[PDB]
């Protein structure tokens, strides 16, 4: 919990943002003005993600992630690869949270009966 | 918690507006006269959204959003990206509210039994 | 909650004490050695009760209650009267708690949906 | 919370012993040889109970309880008053424990959904 | 678990023996030939009980229990007090085991899903 | 586990015998001619019981049981004591066996899913 | 058992990431700039996976896995081969672990009844 | 159980690997770099498979299976044939395991009742 | 004589009654059922006393005596005080009788010689 | 004078019987089975006493005495009160008879000299 | 004389037996074999007493006494009550004999001079 | 008169023997080897007593006495009961004789004066 | 010549334009603003070429060429293919012109001598 | 001879076109949108080539060439194979033309001198 | 012919200026301040070119050229495209001039010899 | 001339074909779709080759050449071997022709001087 996510409300917030934008890249091809946007949004979403994570996960994210180069406009492929990577990493982080929340709840309910 | 959204009825209202307009750009391409409208609508929707958020979410919303180029009529791609960004940001905002609101309900209902 | 009972775990403890002691006077008549005990017990439960109640309820309990005389051995009637008076007052205090506890729950659970 | 009861398995063990022995004093009258036994059992049972309680509950248990007189064999009435007192005090202790432990189970299960 | 009971199968065995013998003393009065039996059985059952308990509980049982004098034939009262005392202590020990057994099962079942 | 009872069909058989005979002494008082029978029946039933038990339980049964005085025809009280002693010992024996027997089943049913 | 995976929350986290990225290579063909990303992500994902695995699983993971050739940009085929390999390898690991964890739940739940 | 598979957790792991890789060859045709990989993967999976099986199955797998040649790149047909051969053999091995596991469970639960 | 006691045989009768009852309260403490009796006895002994005394001594006794209240059970102290008061009053009344009886004898014995 | 007691041999007989039983209640505490005897003995002793007394002493004896409540077994305290009452009442009865009888003997011996 | 006792030599015989046996029950507590003895002696002693008394006293003794129930071993209390009851009744019968025997002697000695 | 005791020197002799042995059981508890002696002595002492009594006293003694169980060793209590029974019965026998012996002495001494 | 090219001065003009623009697409990658230009330029260069060619070559050029779709921005690849295609076709036209122009000169230079 | 090629200016023209396009596939890798063009261009180039070739060369060209598959977008390898095939086939065609054409020049110049 | 270019010295002058500026954009990337210059320079260079071309070339140049967007700063790519467009068009313009100017020089030299 | 090549223009055509295709296998690695093509091309080029050679060279070519198998895709090595084998054989065939063409010319040119 707190050992992983410092701001739980914020990580899901940005998490849903990254997810629905990912579902947009698949919907229709984009143009340079839109691909250039998602690059800026992906960079800012990670910067905003690290503010809500524990020190351990910040570094892990930096080891796994690859910031885009601001001199070349990425492709619809890169944007899908980069975004879905965060979507899976957050959903696996969240699935780790929900399994531990199950352990804490059932343990107190069993420590009572 | 509720310290995050000051005017819930006002925030969710505009959010539903951004959601249904997002479903329209998906349906069929638009013309220049309408894209300029959605651009104007996108700007005013954020302004009315900031009035209903806390200062912490205000700045965060501004750090994540991208103002349009006043001199160029954006494409259907930009408008889908900008709008879906807000739709995702708001759904993650609400999921943080309801998970804590449900947490409040099952804490008092259990503090009784 | 905080407006009435300061130490909830302590109040329902002593109450369940006084409750089961009341079921003993009904079970069989007592002798001087036991009546003198229940009076001594009844005094201490009230002193331990005032420590666990809010200032307003302390006075109300003091205005309603009648301390026993420490020179005459009370009857089985007084002990039933004195104790059952508290049992009803404690059950009425908790029913005041639980009616609001459901209000806190069913209102927060409804403020979400 | 569980800071109140240090050895729960031990506190409830001795409690169950005092409860069923109480069911014996009600079942049939006793003789001096058996009344003397319960007094000895009553003394050691509280000593073993205080070892399993927190210091605050020790004092409260000590402020509420009454050590027997070794010079007089108590009556079947005294032993019922003394024992049921602890039975009521012990059942009220757990009711404080189970209501908060039940609160832990539903609050964490709600912080997830 | 093992910190409390070394031979679980044996303690529930002797326990059911002590319980049904307790239910016989209540059924009809006994004679010196029968009262003398239960004393020897109660003495041997405790010796056989200590073989099946952990070192901590052996000591606790000796502190709570009172061995009979082999110079006077006890009463139907004494035999009921002695036996029911063991019955509650064993039933409270078992209720302590089963409450913790639920904690072990509901914790591994929750740490998995 | 089953290391305890060598002849399960035989141990449970004789047990039901003493159980139903226990229910007969309870129903009505007996005469010297039938008490002498029950004394003989109790002796032969233990002998037939040891053939179906493991050596550890053999001595334990011998440590717990009390052979009758062949001189005096025992009373309805002794016969209730001797018989109910075995009935409790046997019921506690079976619950220890089947509780582990259930453990074998649900462990394999869980090792499959 | 649990000694196999040292950091389950971390192993599964990275697992979900690799799984969803696999669903992206499948969705649409990629370009050379994005294929270079997935190769880099594949290398860092395994590096972070071995940190959360025991040495026995490491070597087994290392004996089974195939580092990419850096002088050549892999195909959309290779990236599917490599990733799906881990996804199956990771899903079988949990199914091997969780099936024994389920055995812990039903064996203790049966060791009680 | 013990007579067929020595390391059950490992065998269902690799099986779930080989299974999902089989679903990749069906999804799209492969290139020389990917076909060459799956062959290397298939060889290593059998080495990791033989380590986890009983000696009889080691030989049975060796009698049924056909190792690939390391000088020619196999076709999409061979790789489907080779892998699917193992998938059926692994699913058939487990159904032999699971059908007996129900026999062990449903028989011990019936030997108890 | 005639001016003091009208029925001397009756007063010495009741006096020995009230006297011997006084030696019982000193012998061992009493219970509510016996204290309630002695109160009833003390009143009836006084009513039967006034019937056997001259009018002057009646009123003297009424000025000296204090009737018990019939709604509260007196203490062993009151009962000791109340009865001993009569015993001293009767023995002083009798010592007045015997001193005059000797005066009648030795004066008539002196008129002769 | 002797008209007071109609059957002197019968009254004093029963009186001696009541006196020595009183010395038995003092010697050791009694049980419910023996207390019930003395209550019945107390009732029949008064009945046999009224047959040997004159009507004036009958009603006086009935006005002073208190019949026991057949619905409750009295205590050793009540039986001491009731019996000692009669012993004192009877000893005062004889002292009233013997003092006047001594007066008769010193009147005829003096009417001669 | 003959109006009351038919066999004077026999009544003082059995009387002494009943008296010294009474002094034994006080001396030390008894066992069932001894308590059962004294019941048989007390029953036969009354039977042997009735053979030596006049018809009037037979009936009075039967009205005063309470035969024991042969279907329960009396207590040390009952045997003391029953025996002491006869001891006083016999001592009061003899004191009635001695008071009249002196009257017969001193009257004939005075009818001579 | 002398028709009752045929051999006075023998009856009194053996009587003193039983008396002094009674004073020995009172002094200290006995062991099984000595209780068997006193039981044997009690049988022969009655046998030698009947030889010195008239047939009427033989049967009467037999109607009052209780033969011991040859197959069971009596307790310290029985021996006191049996012996004290004889001691009292013998003293009452002589006191009846001695009272008549004085009648022979004083009546003949008065026929002279 | 006249049968192939109507405006020779114009074709080598636009041809040189297409050639040097082709050398720019090779020189550095382009952006949507530049890729969009070359599409418009390539379309207008073909339109201006057909005005300068004979009817036979106009048709052949349209059969060989593929106009771009104005509703999508082409790649640096498409523009290179489209442009280079024209460059060779124009260079092949000129080599056909130059080979015949040498035939016109050399044949007349030989028709003279 | 010159009957081989009916339209020399046209065969060389298209030949130059295919040659320089080959120089583009070599220059940089292509994308699916451009690879699809070269397939379409390759088909129309052969169609325009046969119009300028003799029937013998048509079939020979048709016997040597390979029509593309509609479904698959060819690779940079296929397009290089297909195009270079024609360029080599065409350059060998011209070498057959020019070597005999040069033979005419030296034969007529020698038939004169 | 010369009817095409009215001011040859001016047409080539400005052309060389666009050519050498083109060699500068290739040399190093530019900044917004210089791109704004080249954009203005490109506009005036075409204006000064049209003054020196014939009306027919004015339109063709205008039909081929593309005015820049003055609300957006063009890229380094567009400027290379726009400039190279002119550089290619101008060299092709002169090659049409130079081929006819040389044609005049060989025609008069042949009309003389 | 006629002794070796029947259709010289055709053989140097296919040779220049086979030669230029060989320079492609060296240029970049191929895929299965291209390797399968070049094999098909190589087979048909030989069939077209045998049509253009003299019968002696046909058989020699068949003795030297090795036709490919049509069920396995050859390697880039085989394709380089197969074609280069022909290219050398063709260049050696042509170099023999040029030496004989040199023989025909120089011998006739010398027969003149």
CA distance E109 to chain A (A): 8
DSSP letter for each residue of chain F: -TTSBS-HHHHHHHHHHHHHHHHHHHHS---HHHHHHHHHHHHHHHHHHHTTB-HHHHHHHHHH-----SSSPPPHHHHHHHHHHHHHHHHHHHHHHHHHHHHHHHHHHHHH-
CA distance B98 to B112: 21
Could you tell me the CA-to-CA distances from D95 to C13, D88, D112, L39 in Å, in that order? Answer: 7, 11, 27, 65
Structure tokens at C44: 């201490």
Contact call for K88 and J38, based on CB within 8 A: no
Tokens found for residue F4: 């305890």
- Chain-chain contact of M31 with A32 (C-beta, under 8 angstroms): yes
Q: Quick check: K42 and K83 in contact, CB under 8 A?
A: yes
Contact yes or no for E60 and D41 at CB 8 A: no
Rg (CA), chain F: 17
Question: Between chains, do A48 and B26 touch, taking CB under 8 Å as contact?
Answer: no
Question: What residues pair up with L5 in beta bridges, in sequence order?
Answer: L53
What φ, ψ does residue P5 adopt, rounded to 5°? -115, 120
Q: Which two tokens stand for residue D79?
A: 């032993």
Identify the DSSP state of L74: P
Long-range contact list for A105-108, CB < 8 A, 24+ apart? A105/D104, A105/D105, A105/D106, A105/D108, A105/D109, A105/D112, A105/E110, A106/D105, A106/E106, A106/E107, A106/E109, A106/E110, A107/E103, A107/E106, A107/E107, A107/E110, A108/D101, A108/D104, A108/D105, A108/D108
Determine E/G contact with 3+ CB pairs under 8 A as the test: yes
Enumerate the residues of chain J whose CB falls inside 8 A of the CB of residue D31: 31
Largest alpha-carbon pair distance within chain I?
63
| D8-25 vs D76-112: helix crossing angle, rounded to 10 | 140
User: Cβ–Cβ of J32/D29 closer than 8 Å?
Assistant: yes
- Interacting residues of P103 by C-beta distance below 8 A, sequence separation 6+: none
Residue I5: phi, psi to the nearest 5? -115, 120
Residue pair L79/L39 in contact (Cβ under 8 Å)? The answer is yes
Alpha-carbon distance of B85 to E112, in angstroms, equals 35
Q: Subunits with at least 3 CB pairs below 8 A relative to chain E?
A: A, D, F, G, K
- Residue P51 tokens read as 């049509």
* H28 DSSP 8-state letter: S
Identify which of F105, F112, F113 has the shortest CB distance to residue G110.
F105
**Six token digits for residue E3:** 């910190």
**Which tokens sit at D36?**
């003397």
Burial classification of residue F48, based on how many CB atoms lie within 10 Å of its CB (0-12 exposed, 13-18 middle, 19 or more buried):
middle
Residue C60 to chain D, least CA–CA distance (Å):
23
d(CA A65, CA K76): 95
Residues of K in contact with J41 (CB under 8 A): 64, 66, 81, 85
Rounded to a whole number of angstroms, the distance from the CA of C78 to the nearest CA of chain B is 33
Contact E60 D48 (CB under 8 A): yes
CA distance N63 to G45: 52
Can you tell me the distance from the alpha carbon of H70 to that of H80, in angstroms, rounded to the nearest whole number? Answer: 17
DSSP secondary structure letter of residue B7: -
List the single residue in N16, N37, N45 with the smallest CB-CB distance to M78.
Answer: N37
Give SS3 for C53: strand
**Tokens 């003397």 -> residue:** D36
**This structure's resolution (angstroms)?**
3.5
Instruction: Output the CA torsion sign for G96, G98, G104, G107.
Output: negative
For D111, nearest residue in chain A (alpha carbons): A101
Q: At what angle do helices B55-64 and B32-50 cross, to 10 degrees?
A: 150
What's the first-to-final CA gap in chain E, in angstroms? 25
C-beta of residue A56 within 8 angstroms of C-beta of residue A76: no
Q: Rounded CA gap, F92 and D3, in Å? A: 36
Cross-strand pairs, B94: none
Gap between the Cα atoms of P113 and P101, Å rounded:
19
From chain D, the residues in CB contact with J31 under 8 A are 31
Q: Helix, strand, or coil here: L53?
A: strand
Structure tokens at H21: 């890789």
Q: How many Å separate Cα N113 from the centre of its chain?
A: 39
In degrees and rounded to multiples of 5, residue D73 shows phi and psi of -80, 115
Q: How far is CA O108 from CA F4, O101, P70, in A?
A: 132, 11, 68
Nearest Cβ partner for N21 among M66, M75, M88? M88
| Residue in the structure block whose two tokens are 């890729």 | M35
**Rounded to an integer, what distance in angstroms lies between the CA atom of residue G43 and that of residue B65?**
33
Please give the structure tokens belonging to residue A93. Answer: 């982080």
Q: Give Cα separations from E17 to B80, E48, M35 (angstroms).
A: 78, 12, 95
- Candidates K28, K32, K34, K72: best to mutate against E (most CBs of E within 10 A) is K32
Number of H helices, E strands in chain L: 4, 0
- Phi and psi of P53, rounded to 5°? -115, 165
Separation in Å, CA of C107 to nearest CA in chain B:
8
CB F92 within 8 A of CB G89: no
Distance CA A82, CA A67 (A): 9
- Residue B39's contacts (CB-CB under 8 Å, 6 or more residues apart) are B68, B73, B74, B79
Would you call E75 and D10 a contact, using CB atoms and an 8 Å cutoff? no
By Cβ distance, the residue of G12, G28, G30 closest to A96 is G12
Best to test chain A binding among G11, G18, G20 (most A CBs inside 10 Å)? G20
Partners of O53 in the β-ladder: O5
Cβ within 8 Å, pair B102-C111: no
- Nearest one of D105, D103, D98, B108 to C101, comparing CA atoms: B108
CA separation, residue M112 to residues B44, H5, M105 (Å): 87, 102, 11
Assess contact for I49 and I57: CB atoms under 8 A.
no
The chains found to touch N (3+ Cβ pairs under 8 angstroms) are: G, M, P
> Taking every pair of C-alpha atoms in chain G, what is the biggest distance, in angstroms?
63
Best probe of the F interface among H12, H104, H106, by most F CBs < 10 A, is: H104
CA distances from D102 to B108, E94, G4 (A): 11, 22, 34
CB contact under 8 A, N28 and M80: yes
The Cα-based distances of L38 to G74, K33, L21, L31, L79 in angstroms read 114, 16, 8, 11, 7
* Token couple for P46: 């030989």
Sign of CA dihedral L23, L26, L32, L36: positive
> What is chain O's alpha carbon radius of gyration, rounded to the nearest angstrom?
17
Contact E113/A107, CB-based, under 8 Å? no
Residue O5 DSSP code: B
Phi-psi region of G68 (alpha: psi -120 to 50; beta: other; left: phi over 0): beta
The contacts of residue P113 (CB under 8 Å, 6+ apart) are none
Tokens 């396009």 label which residue?
N21
Dihedrals phi, psi of D5, to nearest 5 degrees: -110, 115
CB contact (8 A) between residue C27 and residue D88: no
Using DSSP's 3-state secondary structure scheme, residue A53 falls into strand
Burial class (CB in 10 A: 0-12, 13-18, 19+), F34: middle
N91 in Cβ contact with N12 (< 8 Å): no
Distance (Å, whole) CA F40 – CA F70: 9
Using a CB-CB cut-off of 8 Å, the residues of chain D touching C24 are 80-81, 84
DSSP structure class, residue M7: -
Q: And the tokens for L96?
A: 């009846």
Length of chain O: 113
Distance CA B60, CA B68 (A): 18
Give the 3-state secondary structure of residue H91: helix
Residue B15 CA to residue B86 CA, distance in Å, equals 8
What is the spatial distance between Cα K39 and Cα K49, in angstroms, rounded to a whole number?
A: 15
Q: Whole-angstrom Cα distance, residue H50 to residue H43?
A: 11
Q: How far is CA E110 from each of CA A96, E40, E104, N2, rounded to the nearest angstrom? A: 12, 48, 10, 89
Q: Do chains F and O touch (3 or more CB pairs under 8 A)?
A: no
User: From residue A5, how far is each of A9, A99, D113, H63, M60 by CA, in Å?
Assistant: 9, 14, 17, 53, 68
| Helix-, strand-, coil-residue percentages of chain J, each rounded to 5 | 75, 0, 20
Give the span between the Cα atoms of E111 and A105, in whole angstroms: 10
Q: Report the 3 state secondary structure along chain I.
A: CCCCECCHHHHHHHHHHHHHHHHHHHHCCCCHHHHHHHHHHHHHHHHHHHHCECHHHHHHHHHHCCCCCCCCCCCHHHHHHHHHHHHHHHHHHHHHHHHHHHHHHHHHCCCCC
**K5 within 8 A of K53, measured Cβ to Cβ:** yes
**Nearest alpha-carbon partner for O86 in O105, O70, O69, O67:** O67
CA distance G24 to A79: 11
Give the Cα separation of B32 and B72 in Å (integer). Answer: 10
**Taking the mean position of all CA atoms in its chain, how far away is CA J74?**
19
CA distance G1 to chain H (A): 9
**How many residues would you count in chain N?**
113
For residue L48, CA distances in Å to D75, H59, L53, L83 come to 53, 103, 9, 15
How far CA G24 is from CA of A81, B55, G74, H29, in Å, comes to: 7, 37, 15, 17
CA angle G96, G98, G101 (to 5 degrees): 115
- Would you state the structure tokens that stand for residue E48, as one six-digit string? 């056989």
Contact call for E92 and D45, based on CB within 8 A: no
A96 vs E contacts (CB less than 8 Å): none
G103 → chain F, closest CA residue:
F110
Structure tokens at P47: 């069939």
Q: What is the rounded distance in angstroms from the CA atom of residue E44 to the CA atom of residue E56?
A: 20
- In chain K, where the domains are located: 1-113
Specify the residue for token string 């081969």: G81
D5 by DSSP, 3-state: which?
strand
Residues of chain P positioned with their CB less than 8 A from the CB of N75: 31, 33-34
Say whether A88 and G21 touch across the interface (CB within 8 A). yes
d(CA K40, CA K33): 11
Give the distance from residue A63's alpha carbon to the nearest chain B alpha carbon, in angstroms. 23
- C-alpha–C-alpha distance, residues A78 and G41, integer Å: 12
**Who among B104, B111, B112 is closest to C108 (CB)?**
B104
With CA atoms as reference, report the closest residue to E92 among P89, D12, K72, G74: D12
- By C-alpha distance, which of D11, D1, D3 is closest to D101? D1
Count interface pairs I-J at CB distance under 8 A. Answer: 80
- Experimental method of this PDB entry: X-ray
- What's the gap between Cα H65 and its chain centre? 11
Residues of D within 8 A of E64 (CB-CB) are 14, 17, 41, 44-45, 48
b/e per residue, K49-87, with b = 16+ CB within 10 A?
A: beebbeeebbebbeebbeebeeeebbbbbbbbbbbbbbb
Question: What is the number of other CB atoms lying within 10 angstroms of the CB of residue F70?
Answer: 11
Mutate to test the interface with G, among F1, F94, F96, F103 (most CBs of G within 10 A): F103
Cβ contact, residue pair E81, D30, below 8 Å = yes
Contact B/I (≥3 CB pairs under 8 Å): no
CA distance M68 to M79: 10
Chain H residues with CB inside 8 Å of F104's CB? 104-105, 108-109
Helix axes A76-112 and A55-64, enclosed angle (nearest 10): 150
DSSP H helical segments within M1-113, as ranges? Answer: 8-27, 32-51, 55-64, 76-112
- E107 vs A106: CB contact, 8 Å cut-off? yes
Tell me the nearest-neighbour CA distance from D1 into chain B, angstroms.
Answer: 14
Q: How far is CA B68 from the centre of its chain?
A: 16
Q: To the nearest 5 percent, what fractions of chain N are helix, strand and coil?
A: 75, 0, 20
Are the beta carbons of G108 and E112 separated by less than 8 Å?
no
Of J19, J37, J40, the CB nearest to K88: J19
Contact O89, M14 (CB under 8 A): yes
Residue for token digits 């009856």?
L11
Which other chains touch chain O, taking contact as 3+ CB pairs less than 8 Å apart? B, M
Chains I and M touch (3+ CB pairs under 8 A): no
Q: Given an 8 Å threshold on Cβ–Cβ distance, is G104 in contact with E105?
A: yes
């Amino acid at each position: 919990l707190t050992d992983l996510v410092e701001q739980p409300a914020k990580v899901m917030r940005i998490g849903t943002m990254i997810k629905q934008l990912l579902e947009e890249v698949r919907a229709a091809p984009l143009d340079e003005a839109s691909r250039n946007r998602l690059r800026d949004i992906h960079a800012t979403s990670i910067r905003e993600l690290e503010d809500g994570l524990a020190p351990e996960l910040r570094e892990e994210l930096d080891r796994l992630t690859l910031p885009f180069n601001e001199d070349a406009v990425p492709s619809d492929a890169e944007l899908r690869i980069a975004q879905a990577q965060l979507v899976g990493w957050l959903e696996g982080l969240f699935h780790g949270i929900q399994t531990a929340l199950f352990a804490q709840q059932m343990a107190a309910r069993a420590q009572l009966q």
